[PDB]
Ligand SMILES: Nc1ncnc2c1ncn2[C@@H]1O[C@H](COP(=O)(O)OP(=O)(O)O)[C@@H](O)[C@H]1O
Ligand SMILES: Nc1ncnc2c1ncn2[C@@H]1O[C@H](COP(=O)(O)OP(=O)(O)O)[C@@H](O)[C@H]1O
């Protein structure tokens with residue numbers, strides 16, 4: 071079942087002419103913003119420059135530095151005073167995105183499309199544990215779930231006792247939470263004397279944080295739910311950008327509203343088909359403030375072949391991480407997902423871990439699991455196996471410490487996996 | 493007024509005669525809808541309320557009042573009249589886990605009616621689509637959040653969903669986005685004027701032109717202080733979750749009484765003792781009936797709010813009745829930082845800690861134009877806990893109170909017998925009100 075079958079299963083040929091029509095429209099609109107008027111002027115970008123989807127490569131990339139330099143409204147193309155109805159924001163000077171009613175409705179429709187794809191219906195009780203206000207996850211899932219017709223529960227962030235009360239009393243069936251907060255809720259259910267596997271919950275929507283497939287499976291087993299990967303960023307509206315189908319194998323990118331490129335961070339050229347590179351995105355249905363070839367700093371790849379769900383829209387792999395998550399120790403580049411890929415395979419460990427960098431030495435603290443009935447000798451042998459598998463993957467020997475369950479701190483938002491004290 | 497502009501002129505200046513037949517039509521419809529809920533089906537059954545009981549607006553007095561106690565007893569969905577699974581799109585819940593909260597269930601119709609009322613309110617005080625509207629109200633379950641958000645987008649304003657706190661970020665949004673309309677509780681509007689001068693900005697030389705202030709009692713003088721500090725026009729905004737949230741009653745540009753939208757609400761002023769209508773223009777309890785709500789309508793709901801109907805025609809030309817300021821309540825509820833709290837919510841948290849005594853005192857004070865809530869509770873001599881352990885318990889008390897009442901109080905562990913007795917435990921409100 072599809073929210074918009076004509077688009078979701080649209081032929082690649084028809085998708086291409088839709089992308090080209092909307093790419094030309096986006097460029098004509100964006101030409102009215104002070105920023106893209108100047109960019110187009112200096113690079114000879116006119117109304118005749120785009121004749122094919124490949125002609126987008128004539129236009130230079132938009133970086134986060136360019137957006138900071140033109141903060142707050144240098145990239146606003148429309149009439150903000152008359153048609154601008156919302157401002158959202160993403161250390162530093164946060165960037166803002168300005169939306170028109172058109173832009174909000176397009177965003178809401180994409181979120182309803184995503185929720186419907188993973189089996190959520192108007193009969194579902196949808197609870198949003200994302201922060202509201204300026205955070206796109208709040209109003210983003212709120213409008214999308216109301217668009218679909220769910221009985222929504224705008225719980226917002228924190229207060230786990232109240233979250234559990236709403237789930238129990240309102241019979242919540244669909245929940246939006248960051249993966250680490252979903253684990254925290256399952257723990258508070260047990261603390262309050264409720265079996266986290268015997269609630270009314272059926273579907274979880276998890277995003278914002280990089281996480282392994284096994285981290286998601288741990289969440290699924292903990293709460294007896296089906297959990298789906300949700301991709302988004304403020305620059306691209308917020309949620310509803312890319313989402314897993316019921317196949318749970320790659321996130322379908324809505325190519326009617328986004329032009330996806332996977333560029334080599336060194337050369338600035340497209341990577342060979344299916345290789346890892348920087349995700350570079352162009353809005354195709356945004357009017358107040360469109361973004362052209364925006365360098366997301368997110369590393370991923372395009373998963374090949376058509377998906378068994380019948381949707382023609384391309385699938386991206388699990389986000390490897392963001393460029394700013396990468397840390398260097400002893401001249402060697404390491405991503406925290408490399409450390410998680412190893413830790414999740416050990417069932418004696420918990421889901422909370424912390425990487426500390428000191429003067430260079432790398433410390434990997436990871437909480438012990440409650441299920442563990444292991445003694446010192448057997449747990450110390452497991453700790454030795456971890457230092458070893460970490461030395462083989464990250465190519466540096468870290469210090470590994472098995473810590474008490476609950477000893478590591480829990481973040482208000484996205485969990486902080488790296489503490490650089492150098 | 494000839495130069496006066498209306499969001500919905502046909503409704504806003506509608507004759508009292510035409511308003512009466514609109515209220516009667518919608519009152520009959522509300523009663524027929526509410527009869528489908530388990531709660532009103534029972535109430536109507538015991539009191540012989542049928543489809544022929546309401547022939548005039550005065551016939552509403554045949555129906556008994558709906559109290560908060562009744563609602564908590566029918567928690568969560570005893571008063572839901574519509575098809576919640578198919579048409580229910582939102583739940584607004586009051587605070588707490590120590591008792592049954594209040595739940596208001598809305599359909600898309602109910603949200604659109606509520607958004608239209610908020611747009612009507614904002615337009616009345618001169619806000620247009622050309623304005624930059626910043627909402628400093630909390631979002632999530634708080635109706636001021638999503639209420640003004642939908643209302644301001646309906647009007648077409650460039651909205652800034654700032655949400656509560658972080659005054660330096662509030663001032664940054666006002667300066668960088670050129671905010672012209674701001675929704676804030678009166679004490680927070682003063683705080684932002686103070687933070688503006690702390691950061692070296694003249695609070696009178698910003699892009700701000702209009703302020704919408706509500707959630708708590710404030711005097712006309714406290715509003716004038718706000719207008720002088722920020723060089724703005726500030727307007728009183730009334731609402732309650734039960735009645736949607738914001739958009740229920742609002743001042744016009746005359747700044748003399750809050751216009752109640754009688755097309756969506758039937759207003760009664762009742763004696764808190766007798767339950768009978770008060771003499772025209774006297775102070776009494778505000779008893780309200782929804783007239784445009786379908787998923788969960790409320791009939792003759794005892795709000796516990798005390799006010800009076802201001803007499804005479806308004807020069808703005810609107811025919812909808814005006815209520816005076818809400819100065820207080822007939823119940824034991826208190827409001828601090830615009831958040832509603834019952835003393836029982838505090839007591840039900842404290843009793844869980846065996847290191848504490850039974851004697852406690854809630855003090856409400858104003859410190860540098862900001863409100864503070866102090867919870868003093870006596871130590872039990874039964875505890876064998878040292879300083880470090882007690883202080884850890886005091887932090888756990890603050891934490892559990894914060895989660896419960898949705899405001900962070902100051903908690904002080906006092907000596908056994910230090911707090912005075914007389915008796916229900918009192919709320920010492922030392923604020924200028
Ligand atoms: N499902 C996901 N998996 C991994 N990383 C994600 C996922 N969703 C979002 N992200 C990360 O979060 C970034 C977007 O964050 P941002 O828009 O600022 O905040 P928000 O979390 O409030 O949507 C992405 O660029 C990416 O790095
Ligand atoms: N403008 C106002 N003046 C005085 N009291 C007000 C005003 N607006 C709201 N209130 C009080 O707040 C109550 C409604 O509180 P509630 O909806 O629970 O919280 P909130 O609107 O602050 O989220 C009203 O019944 C009334 O007592």
Ligand SMILES: [K+]
Nearest residue numbers: 192221577580
């Ligand atoms: K529904």
Ligand SMILES: [K+]
Nearest residue numbers: 151154649650
């Ligand atoms: K606008």
Ligand SMILES: [K+]
Nearest residue numbers: 707830831832
């Ligand atoms: K209030």
Ligand SMILES: [Zn+2]
Nearest residue numbers: 315317377379
């Ligand atoms: Zn698929």
Ligand SMILES: [Zn+2]
Nearest residue numbers: 744806808810
């Ligand atoms: Zn008036």
